[PDB]
Structures are given as structure tokens and as C-alpha cells.
Amino acid sequence: EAEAEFTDACVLPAVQGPCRGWEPRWAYSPLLQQCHPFVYGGCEGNGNNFHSRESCEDACPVVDHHHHHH
Template sequence: MKFLATVCLIFALFFEVLGFKNSVCNQEPRGYVDTYIICAGYMPRFTYYAESNSCQEYIYNGCFEICGLPHSGNGDGKRSCMGFFPSWSYNSDKNECIEFIYGGCGGNDNRFGSKEICEDKCLE
């Protein structure tokens, strides 16, 4: 009985990993604001508070509110984000992980923090 349960668990994990690879690794990387904003930055910044006459640190996530974003200038209504996050994405045509700069907004799950993680999740 334990053997059968182990076999079922192995098959379930195999199909879970296979499903992840097919659903995530074949997405084209995106880095612009589409409909929703996904901001995942972690950038320490400082601001001045007049009340206390001091500078205090805060964490900036890489995105402004949608109305505060600068217009991209291309006339299509899309706006760019100001982040600069070196990231990795799987390229299914080349079967390799490639580096790109993520702006901090939009995007999809085909974005990894390192080449090693990308290769671990996506390479055959």
C-alpha cells in the first residue's frame, strides 16, 4: 500500500512540475503596464520629514500610482515603469534562459531572479 501511495505521489509531482513548465516557461516576458500593476521592487530610499527635521528610510517598490507614471510617448496609452531589475526568462525557441531588465510593472510568471532558478524550472 505504501508503494502504491509513493508511486501516486511521484506521478502527481511529475505532472505538477510539467504543468508549471508548460504554463510559465512558454510565456513571453513583459515589462510594461498592461491592465494591472505588479510591483515587486525592494529599493531603500530616504525622504525628509520637516516635523522631525530628519531623513527617514522607506522601501520603494518600483512603481508609482498609475496616474503618476510618465507617459511612454508612443500614443497607445501604455505607460512605462522606472524600475531596473535584472531578471531571467526562458526562451523556448533557443531552449535557454536569457537575461533582461524588468521595469517593475506588468509582466508575467516567466521572470526569475537568477539564471540558476530559471534553468532549474524550465530547461529540459
């Protein structure tokens, strides 16, 4: 799959970063079961930061990235 057993972008919230500059990005929302655009800060952020609709939709929603469920 997308192998991401670590802190998966699909499982993580969007992160803006510590700055105050504003740059549009895409992040997956599990609470929305889908991606949406958001205001990112251009500086440091986590893996749930996509550059396009495309890349975010691959991040999810697709077949469940084989997470270590019970």
C-alpha cells in the first residue's frame, strides 16, 4: 500500500507550523474522511502537508494504508 505504519498523514491533523506567513496547502482530515485545502505557514510542518489535490487524495482517501489495528 502506502506503507505508512508510522504517524500516517491520513491519521494526523493538518499542521501550519510556528510561522505567521500564510501559504495554501492540502491536508487529509479523517474527521471529514477526505482532504481539503488549508492555510500552512511555509516553515516547518509534519507529513500531512500536500501540495495539490492529487497528492492529498493519494495520502487518503484510498484503500486503507494497512494500519496495525487490533
